Amino acid sequence: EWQPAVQILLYSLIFLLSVLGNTLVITVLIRNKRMRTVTNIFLLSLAVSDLMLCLFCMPFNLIPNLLKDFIFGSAVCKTTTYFMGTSVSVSTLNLVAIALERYSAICKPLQSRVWQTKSHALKVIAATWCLSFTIMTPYPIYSNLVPFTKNNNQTANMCRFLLPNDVMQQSWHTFLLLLLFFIPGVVMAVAYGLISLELYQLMAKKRVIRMLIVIVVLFFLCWMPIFSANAWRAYDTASAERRLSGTPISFILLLSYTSSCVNPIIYCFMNKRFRLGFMATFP
């Protein structure tokens, strides 16, 4: 029972912290009108998408993995699977949105004055949410309880997802891991690379540059594992499941969700301009 006891402690802690962090960022950024800058529009959007990711991924992956059957109805398997992919998708384009905005402001300061506005930020927010809700539509369609029976002769289920053939399954998993992880991570490596280079070309500058390196590291550590696993299963579902099913994939998933825990820390709480906003937001 030790591995289950650790697994519930880890998930419940990371859940409570990701709820608290994102809801505080949402709170302090809505109350303080002063803190309403192009960047803080993306941080508010990001914190909402991370709050959805926390609420709809974490408990609904934990509880079935503890019970060893999917306890909720087909409507819950459909609805959760939609919001999981939706929240994961919006976040990865809000993190590539913050890196390309920061790069325009820091490496081309005059030219960006033409377009970098609060209205332009809200165009990119609206386009990102709408295109995420759009492309994730297969999830509530082809995600339906699949039945089996336990050794106690109880009927049991496992929520799963299946395009109509294996070529569609493989091409789909290749598309999501090359447009919701790979390129989103090579454009955050070249954006924060160029910002670090031009910024370094001194103690404050080195304090900035180590944060830019930590951001591109934490992105690849959270997401590479889960996006590579899904691709493994879509090719040899049998070998992938024989290796990773049960306890191992639950930690690859926890590592993925830990992104929605760290984002409030590295983007908000590490800057007192917001930390004071916090001190100004509450009595």
Binding site: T81, M84, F161, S245
Partner: peptide
């Protein structure tokens, strides 16, 4: 038995 995993 319970095998595989949801995508996210």
């Amino acid at each position: 038995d319970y095998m595989g995993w949801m995508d996210f």
